[PDB]
Amino acid sequence: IVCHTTATSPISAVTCPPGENLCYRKMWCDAFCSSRGKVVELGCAATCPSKKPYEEVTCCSTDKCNPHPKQRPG
Amino acid sequence: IVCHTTATSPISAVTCPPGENLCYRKMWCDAFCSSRGKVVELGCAATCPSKKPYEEVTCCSTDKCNPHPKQR
């Protein structure tokens, strides 16, 4: 699977390692949520990450299924 | 009106200044929300404070109507 990631500069799409067959997006607010919106973490995973309180996580299993908000398709 | 405030040490109940007849509670997450819970700002106001996205603001108009979760 190919996933978007926020581990790179610029943000990019990567082929996930073997055994990591999901893409994920984890978002949460920090103190600047009211101006910059949610913090977004994108990457590859073997199992969908578990969420702590006030965090959201979604996973998906098609290429590039987890875009940053400023990189959604058109 | 007497309102709880988070501007004092320790946090306390204060007689609001003239023209400030509401108590308010304003909450948001910071980077520790997942462990410490929301940040809470308590005080007096003349009008209910404007809210930005991801902020919650609620006002009330009886004495000490806006307690901090840990004094409640």
Epitope: - | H68, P69, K70
Partner: antibody, heavy 131, light 115 residues
Framework: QVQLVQSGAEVKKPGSSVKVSCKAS????????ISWVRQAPGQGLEWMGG????????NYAQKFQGRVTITADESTSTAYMELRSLRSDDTAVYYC????????????????????????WGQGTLVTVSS | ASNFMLTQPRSVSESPGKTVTISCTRS????????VHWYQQRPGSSPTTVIY?????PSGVPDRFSGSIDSSSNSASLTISGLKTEDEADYYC???????????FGGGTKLTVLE
Amino acid sequence: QVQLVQSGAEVKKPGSSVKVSCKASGGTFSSYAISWVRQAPGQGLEWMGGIIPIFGTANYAQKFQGRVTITADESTSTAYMELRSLRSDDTAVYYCARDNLGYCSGGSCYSDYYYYYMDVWGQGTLVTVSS
Amino acid sequence: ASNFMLTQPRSVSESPGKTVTISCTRSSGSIGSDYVHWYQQRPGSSPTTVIYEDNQRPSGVPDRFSGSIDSSSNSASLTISGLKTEDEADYYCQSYDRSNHEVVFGGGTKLTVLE
């Protein structure tokens, strides 16, 4: 560079109480929490509770609730641990320790208790209880 | 009613210059649900923090100290590369039990340097 300075070692009879002090340099606790942590001889660290002066509230571990009282006076920046009904299992070194993450900044404060890492530790106080 | 446990090996011994890992396994609940921190306690001294928030180093702690989390084994680990005799001490992990509202300490690991 706050330091925490504790009172000295004591030797006690069973059934008595000990009240150990912890004075913070700088004249204030600000919005920090102070914990008490003890260590029986050759054993591990054990949390007893803590206090958050800016809220006027204290939190206790179940093992000690009802026998220990933790207090603090902002005016003297001193915290205290009073442990009553002393027994042999209470021979231990007692430490106070500051929670690195203050509870308030900018006129607002966190909603929930959550004991974070302990950055500044006192020097320890040995309390020895006879049989 | 009981807090979760954080289990550490009681003793670890290794030659200087080598890398040692000390693990801390959470007995119930996910390790990732709560930050893990690590303290060093030299004999006759108070604890000091070597790692906080799973993998952060306080100012002044050598970069030979690192922290990690392994979700599959529900553990946190402290790693010390380039082991030195001055690293001999007891090491404790620490987390927090939200249900009981209590700090939880691991049992401690005594690190000895073999000559």
